[PDB]
Design a protein around this ligand. Structure first.
Ligand SMILES: *[C@@H]1O[C@H](CO)[C@@H](O)[C@H](O)[C@H]1NC(C)=O
Ligand SMILES: *[C@@H]1O[C@H](CO)[C@@H](O)[C@H](O)[C@H]1NC(C)=O
Ligand SMILES: *[C@@H]1O[C@H](CO)[C@@H](O)[C@H](O)[C@H]1NC(C)=O
Ligand SMILES: *[C@@H]1O[C@H](CO)[C@@H](O)[C@H](O)[C@H]1NC(C)=O
Ligand SMILES: *[C@@H]1O[C@H](CO)[C@@H](O)[C@H](O)[C@H]1NC(C)=O
Ligand SMILES: *[C@@H]1O[C@H](CO)[C@@H](O)[C@H](O)[C@H]1NC(C)=O
Ligand SMILES: *[C@@H]1O[C@H](CO)[C@@H](O)[C@H](O)[C@H]1NC(C)=O
Lengths: 276, 121, 223, 112
C-alpha cells in the first residue's frame, strides 16, 4: 500500500449543530429534556482539509494523519461530488483488533467490521481500465481481511450528489456514536448556498444505522477516493468535532420534527431557559 | 532489496568526500532515501532526504548547506557529499531507506551496507 | 373486548442448538458472548435440555419468561468449579466474581448451571479450562479480561519471571471423576435482558392475532 | 541537538523482561506520536525493531512491545537472551523539521 495523502489544519466554531433524535418517538409539541451525548454549542470544531498532489518534490514532509475518537465525533463534510467515501473506526488499525470499514461506492455501503491491515494512509483507488470501462475501485486501504464477522451491505450511505439546480449542495453531517456495544450513526443532508460554514439553524439529525457490533474503537480517519491517472490532485473538507455529555432541551415541532434546542450550559441565560 | 554503498574512503582534514549508495530490488524513485552518521562507538545521527522523484536534498540545521546530496535515477544510485571536513565526523555512513511508498515517514530499514569515511591529520 | 398481540411476522428460531449442546464451553476467563437478534425465542428447548441445578432468573420469572421480549439478549458460556456455582449471582466476591466474571448490580437476566462432569471430563484430568486466580483489582461487570501479566506479589519487580512471590494470574482445576458431586466441574449459561427502551425484536412464537380497533383492545404491540 | 538521551547502559538476566527508556524534549514526544527503536547489532548496520509506538514490522518474533506516556518509550523485551547484548537506539520525529537519534542503552545480560 502507498502513503501519499497529507492533511492541513484549521479551526472554526460549529455555531449550532449535532442535535439528533435520541430515539424514534412521535413526540409532537413536546418540550423534552433528553440528556445524552451531544456536540456542545459554539464548540471549536477542526477543519481538516486533506490535500493531495500528483507526486513530485517530496520535500521531506512527514505524513501526519491521525485522529482520536473521544466519545462520538461529528464528521460534517461539505464537499460537493463524492470523494469522502468512508471511515475506518478502530482502536489499533492493525492485525490485532477489530475495525470498521464503512465504504460507500455508487450503489452500496460495505460496512465490513474485520481485523484489517490498515497502513499509515488508506485511500480508495478508482482506476480507469479501458477508455470508459465504467469505474472500478480496488484495495490499498487493507491487505489482510482476517478472522471476523459479517458485513452489512445496505443502501448507499451518502446520496449521489443530487445537484441539478446549480447550488452548493448538501452539508453532509454524520454523528458516529459508540455506546454499550452498539454503533449508532446519524445523518442529515441539509443543502446550503455558495459560501457557508454551517450557518445558524437548529436542524436535527436522523438515525440511519444501528450496528449491533461492539468494539473498543478509539481512533479513526476518513477514506478518500483518488482518481487514478501518479493519482490526480485530490481534496476534501473534514469537519471532525467531538461530542460531550451535555443536557439538552429539545423543542419538538408539530410533525414530530425537532427545530430548536439549547445546551443548558453555554450561558446562564441558556440554563434558565433549560430549567424554565 | 539489498542496497550497496562505496568502499572505505580516506581524506586528510579540511577536505571533501563524496559517498555513493545504489538501490536494488524495488522501484528506486518511489521510496525515500536517508543518510545517517555515528562516530565509532557513539550515538547515531540523521542527515536528510534525497527523494528521487525530485531533489529535496534536506538536511538538519547542524549540517545546513554543508551536505549536498544528489540523486541519480538512471543508475538507481544516491550520491551524498560533504564539504570542509576536519576530523569532526570521521564516522560510519549508512544510506537509509524508509518504510513508505510515496510520501515518507522517517522509519528506517534496509540500512545499506555501511561505509567508513575516515579523516585524520 | 378483545386482545391484540400483533407481533413481527417471522419464524427463524433463535440460536440455541449451538448455545447449550455446544462442543466445549470456553474457560471462565475467556467467556463467550453470543449476541442473539432478529429471531424468535424458543425457551422451551432450555427446559427440554436437562433438569438444572440452578435456574435463578433475576430479571423475570421462568414461567413469565416464555411470553415476553426485549430488544436483544446475550448468552455467556462458562465451566466452573463446583463451589462458585452460586457466585454467578449478582453481587458477591470470590475467586471468580472480582477476578473472572461479575454480573451488574442491577442484573435482569437468567443463570443456568448443570452437570458436565460425567459428560465432559477426563479420568486423567483436563487442564483446558482455566480461571483467573490473581488480578490487580476487581473486574468491572460485563468485562472480558484476557491479559496474563504476572502479578506483582513481591517487592522485587517480577517482570515475567516464574518463581517465588511470582504467581501467574491463570490457574486451572483438576476435573477428575474422583471428585465429590458437590464440587465437580459445572457448566454455566448466563442470559442478559434489557429494559425494553428500544423496539423489541426477539421472543416466543406467540400467535399474532388479528388487529381490531375502534371498539376495545388488550393492546400488546411488543409492550 | 541530540535532545533524546536514554540510559547509558542497562543489565538483565536470561528470561527476565527489562524495559529501556527513551527520554528527551517533551515537545518532541508529546507533540508528535512517532517513536522508533532501531536495534544496533555491533559490528554491522543497525536495523528497525518497532517502527511506531506499538507497531512491529515483519521478522521481529513479536518479542518487543512499545509504550508511550508524555516522554516514555520502551520495548519490553521478552526473554533477554544472550543475542540481545546488541546496542539499542531510540528516535522520534521532532517538533522541528528534523529527526533525533538517541544514544546509549548498551544492554548487558548474564554470562560476562
Ligand atoms: C478553538 O479551540 C481550540 C482548542 O482545541 C484552540 O486550539 C483554537 O485556538 C481555538 N480557536 C478559536 C478560533 O477559538
Ligand atoms: C459496489 O459495492 C457493492 C458492495 O456490495 C459491490 O457488490 C459492487 O460490485 C460495487 N460496485 C462497484 C462499481 O464498485
Ligand atoms: C483468526 O482466528 C482463527 C481462529 O483461532 C485462527 O486460526 C486464525 O489464524 C486467525 N487469523 C486469521 C487471519 O484467520
Ligand atoms: C481500549 O484500549 C485502550 C488502549 O490502551 C485501553 O486502555 C482500554 O482499557 C480499552 N478498553 C476496553 C473496553 O477494552
Ligand atoms: C407539518 O406538515 C404540514 C404538511 O405540509 C405543513 O403544512 C406544516 O407546516 C408542518 N409543520 C411544521 C413544518 O412545523
Ligand atoms: C522540484 O524538483 C525539480 C526537479 O524534480 C527541481 O528542479 C526543483 O528545484 C525542485 N523544487 C525545489 C523547491 O527545490
Ligand atoms: C445438540 O444436543 C444433542 C442431544 O443429543 C446432541 O446429540 C448434539 O450433538 C448437540 N448439537 C451439537 C452441535 O453438538
Amino acid at each position: 500500500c502507498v502513503n501519499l495523502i497529507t492533511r492541513t489544519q484549521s479551526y472554526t466554531n460549529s455555531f449550532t449543530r449535532g442535535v439528533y433524535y435520541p430515539d424514534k418517538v412521535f413526540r409532537s409539541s413536546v418540550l423534552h429534556s433528553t440528556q445524552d451525548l451531544f456536540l456542545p454549542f459554539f464548540s471549536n470544531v477542526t477543519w481538516f482539509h486533506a490535500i493531495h498532489v500528483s507526486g513530485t518534490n517530496g520535500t521531506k514532509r512527514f505524513d501526519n494523519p491521525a485522529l482520536p475518537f473521544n466519545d462520538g465525533v461529528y464528521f460534517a463534510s461539505t464537499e460537493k461530488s463524492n470523494i469522502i467515501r468512508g471511515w475506518i473506526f478502530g482502536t489499533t488499525l492493525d492485525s490485532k483488533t477489530q475495525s470498521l470499514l464503512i465504504v460507500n461506492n455508487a450503489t452500496n455501503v460495505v460496512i465490513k467490521v474485520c481485523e484489517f491491515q490498515f497502513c499509515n494512509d488508506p485511500f480508495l483507488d478508482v482506476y480507469q481500465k479501458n477508455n470508459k470501462s465504467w469505474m472500478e475501485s480496488e484495495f490499498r486501504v487493507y491487505s489482510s481481511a482476517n478472522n471476523c464477522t459479517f458485513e452489512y451491505v445496505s443502501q448507499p450511505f451518502l446520496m449521489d450528489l443530487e445537484g441539478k439546480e446549480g447550488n452548493f449542495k448538501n452539508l453532509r453531517e454524520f454523528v458516529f456514536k459508540n455506546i454499550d456495544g452498539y454503533f449508532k450513526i446519524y445523518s442529515k443532508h441539509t443543502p446550503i448556498n455558495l459560501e457557508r460554514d454551517l450557518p445558524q439553524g437548529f436542524s436535527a439529525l436522523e438515525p440511519l444505522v444501528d450496528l449491533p457490533i461492539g468494539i473498543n474503537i478509539t481512533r479513526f480517519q476518513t477514506l478518500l477516493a483518488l482518481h487514478r491517472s501518479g493519482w490526480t490532485a485530490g481534496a476534501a473538507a473534514y469537519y471532525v468535532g467531538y461530542l460531550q455529555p451535555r443536557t439538552f432541551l429539545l423543542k419538538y415541532n408539530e410533525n414530530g420534527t425537532i427545530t430548536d434546542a439549547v445546551d443548558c450550559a453555554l450561558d446562564p441565560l441558556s440554563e434558565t431557559k433549560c430549567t424554565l | 532489496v539489498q542496497l550497496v554503498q562505496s568502499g572505505a574512503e580516506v581524506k586528510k582534514p579540511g577536505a571533501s568526500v563524496k559517498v555513493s549508495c545504489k538501490a536494488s530490488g524495488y522501484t528506486f524513485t518511489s521510496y525515500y532515501m536517508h543518510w545517517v552518521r555515528q562516530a565509532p562507538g557513539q550515538g547515531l545521527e540523521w542527515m536528510g532526504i534525497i527523494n528521487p522523484s525530485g531533489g529535496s536534498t534536506s538536511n538538519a540545521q547542524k549540517f545546513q548547506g554543508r551536505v549536498t546530496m544528489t540523486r541519480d535515477t538512471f543508475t538507481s544510485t544516491v550520491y551524498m557529499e560533504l564539504s570542509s571536513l576536519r576530523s569532526e565526523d570521521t564516522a560510519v555512513y549508512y544510506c537509509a531507506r524508509d518504510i513508505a511508498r510515496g510520501i515518507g515517514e522517517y522509519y528506517f530499514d534496509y540500512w545499506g551496507q555501511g561505509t567508513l569515511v575516515t579523516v585524520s591529520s | 373486548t378483545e386482545s391484540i398481540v400483533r407481533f413481527p411476522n417471522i419464524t427463524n428460531l433463535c440460536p440455541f442448538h449451538e448455545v447449550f449442546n455446544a462442543t466445549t464451553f470456553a474457560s471462565v476467563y475467556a467467556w463467550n458472548r453470543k449476541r442473539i437478534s432478529n429471531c424468535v425465542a424458543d425457551y422451551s428447548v432450555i427446559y427440554n435440555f436437562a433438569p438444572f441445578f440452578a435456574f435463578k432468573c433475576y430479571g423475570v420469572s421462568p414461567t413469565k419468561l416464555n411470553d415476553l421480549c426485549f430488544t436483544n439478549v446475550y448468552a455467556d458460556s462458562f465451566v466452573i468449579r463446583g463451589n462458585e456455582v452460586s457466585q454467578i449471582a449478582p453481587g458477591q466476591t470470590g475467586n471468580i466474581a472480582d477476578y473472572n466474571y461479575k454480573l451488574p448490580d442491577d442484573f435482569t437476566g437468567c443463570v443456568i448451571a448443570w452437570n458436565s462432569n460425567k459428560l465432559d471430563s477426563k479420568p486423567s484430568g483436563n487442564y483446558n479450562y482455566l480461571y483467573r486466580l490473581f488480578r490487580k483489582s476487581k473486574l468491572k461487570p460485563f468485562e472480558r479480561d484476557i491479559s496474563t501479566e504476572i502479578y506483582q506479589a513481591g517487592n522485587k519487580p517480577c517482570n515475567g519471571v516464574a518463581g517465588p512471590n511470582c504467581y501467574s494470574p491463570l490457574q486451572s482445576y483438576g476435573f477428575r471423576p474422583t471428585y465429590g458431586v458437590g464440587h465437580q466441574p459445572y457448566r454455566v449459561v448466563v442470559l442478559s435482558f434489557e429494559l425494553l427502551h428500544a423496539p423489541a425484536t426477539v421472543c416466543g412464537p406467540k400467535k399474532s392475532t388479528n388487529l381490531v380497533k375502534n371498539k376495545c383492545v388488550n393492546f400488546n404491540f411488543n409492550g | 541537538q541530540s535532545a533524546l538521551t536514554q540510559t547509558a547502559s542497562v543489565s538483565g538476566s536470561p528470561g527476565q523482561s527489562i524495559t529501556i527508556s527513551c527520554t528527551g524534549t517533551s515537545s518532541d514526544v508529546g507533540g508528535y506520536n512517532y517513536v522508533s527503536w532501531y536495534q544496533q547489532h555491533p559490528g554491522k548496520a543497525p536495523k528497525l525493531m518497532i517502527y511506531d509506538v506499538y507497531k512491529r514490522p515483519s521478522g521481529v518474533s513479536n518479542r518487543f512491545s512499545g509504550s508511550k506516556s508524555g516522554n516514555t518509550a520502551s520495548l519490553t523485551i521478552s526473554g533477554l537472551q544472550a543475542e540481545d547484548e546488541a546496542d539499542y537506539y531510540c528516535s522520534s520525529y521532532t517538533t522541528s523539521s528534523t529527526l533525533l537519534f538517541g544514544g546509549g542503552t548498551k544492554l548487558t545480560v548474564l554470562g560476562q
